[PDB]
């Protein structure tokens, strides 16, 4: 004896959540607390959903128009744009997961309808594997010069999206010729760089810890140029495509420079 979804106003949370990556990972059991739970709040034009420095309560999804984010460097100064944000974008994690007052005013751009979860039924499905993924990957995000240019809180967006994948000896990662599907940062082990020529396979590069690779296919929507294939045990985390393509920004002069490792110059 349970209270039944709607199955339409499940059919729009899902809408709007396909591609957030804190609610792709919930489980089926939470997914149903997230479809019966959530509830819509709109905002016109201008106003504020939040404001820096308040108690948390809510935590949000847009489901229509834009949100500028905002930031105050101390209580008596002005706020500075640091952001703006869209449909699937979330917000209001952190006043919930730490307990801590608003790290940012969110102001409406446009009209807005946003989908929103309150405080309890945030604690319960997201804030301990959301917390747990972001203090596992810190040290790492904070010593991969990849990610040198990320702010803390893309840091935090960064161990979000992330997503663990383990390749044992001789096992292809992406394949020369293939579409490009996902973008990898190893962890540990070894990869090689292997490129055919006339018929022949040889092997152009190796890749080690803290090394990446993928990018190229996913930033130029080209099939990949090489075949990477783990020699040994490696541990790996992956970006997909539209992961990559969200959060590429803060690394994109860093990729855009490594590319000249990979030709002599003219
Ligand atoms: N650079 C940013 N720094 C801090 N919070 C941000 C930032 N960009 C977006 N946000 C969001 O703004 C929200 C403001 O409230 P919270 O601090 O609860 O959670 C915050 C994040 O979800
Ligand atoms: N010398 C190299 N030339 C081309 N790609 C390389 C080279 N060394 C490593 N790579 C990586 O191999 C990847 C194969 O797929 P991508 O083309 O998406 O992006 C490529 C780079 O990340």
Redesign the pocket.
């Given at each position: 004896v349970k209270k039944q979804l709607n199955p339409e106003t499940k059919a729009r949370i899902e809408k709007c959540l396909r591609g957030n990556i804190l609610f792709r990972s919930l489980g089926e059991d939470s997914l149903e607390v997230v479809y019966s739970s959530m509830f819509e709040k709109t905002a016109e034009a201008g106003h504020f959903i939040m404001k820096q420095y308040d108690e948390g309560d809510n935590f949000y999804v847009i489901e229509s128009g834009t949100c500028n984010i905002l930031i105050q460097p101390n209580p008596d100064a002005e706020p500075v744009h640091k952001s703006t944000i869209g449909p699937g974008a979330s917000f209001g994690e952190l006043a919930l997961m730490y307990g801590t007052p608003r790290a940012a005013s969110v102001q409406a751009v446009s009209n807005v309808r946003l989908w929103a979860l309150d405080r309890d039924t945030f604690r319960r499905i997201l804030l301990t594997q959301t917390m747990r993924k972001r203090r596992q990957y810190e040290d790492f995000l904070a010593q991969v010069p990849l990610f040198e240019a990320l702010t803390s809180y893309e840091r935090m967006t960064m161990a979000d999206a992330l997503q663990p994948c383990t390749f044992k000896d001789k096992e292809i990662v992406?394949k020369?010729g293939e579409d490009?599907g996902s973008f990898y940062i190893i962890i540990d082990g070894k990869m090689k760089?292997n490129?055919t020529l006339n018929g022949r396979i040889h092997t152009?590069?190796i890749?080690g810890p803290k090394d990446?690779?993928?990018?190229?296919?996913?930033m130029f929507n080209?099939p990949?140029?090489?075949?990477?294939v783990s020699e040994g045990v490696s541990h790996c985390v992956s970006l997909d495509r539209e992961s990559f393509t969200a959060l590429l920004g803060p690394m994109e002069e860093i990729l855009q420079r490594n590319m000249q490792?990979?030709?002599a110059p003219r």
């Open positions: 992406v020369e490009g760089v490129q152009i590069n890749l990446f690779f993928g990018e190229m296919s996913l080209q990949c140029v090489a075949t990477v490792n990979y030709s």
